[PDB]
Amino acid sequence: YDIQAWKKQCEELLNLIFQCEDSEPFRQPVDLLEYPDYRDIIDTPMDFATVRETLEAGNYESPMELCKDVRLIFSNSKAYTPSKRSRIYSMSLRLSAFFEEHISSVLSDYKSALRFHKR
């Protein structure tokens, strides 16, 4: 029933993601000195510190918006990878699976709380 509960749930999931070794390449914006062509391939950079800061600033209205930005971290890695077997892309796939496994109930609970609010 709680239409605000998603925010703390997302903070806790981000905390788990930050603790996970697989998130290290994604914790901060991609370094252009390390990957000079990055912005030729990627129009909208995204990283987990930006997601956490947007959430903490009160700049997400719903968990769907947070999801869209987290999914953009993963689609950027898929678009930038030179190979489906690259180390960083393989880390993104595991992290995506972990994220999707945990965000599912957050989205479901939010959408059902919102439907209850508008009943």
Ligand X SMILES: CNCc1nnc2ccccn12
Rounded Cα–Cα distance for residues 4 and 22 (Å) = 29
Q: Is 48 in the site for ligand X (CB under 6 A)?
A: no
Q: Give min distance, CB of 56 to ligand X, in A.
A: 22
Rounded Cα–Cα distance for residues 21 and 37 (Å) = 25
Which span (9-17, 62-70, 73-81, 107-115) binds ligand X, by CB under 6 A? 73-81
* Residue from 60, 89, 99, 110 in contact with ligand X (CB under 6 A): 89
Q: Cα 4–7–71 angle (5° rounding)? A: 125
Q: Please give the structure tokens belonging to residue 74.
A: 């993963």
Q: Which residues bind ligand X (CB under 6 A)?
A: 25-26, 30, 35, 77, 80-81, 86, 88-89
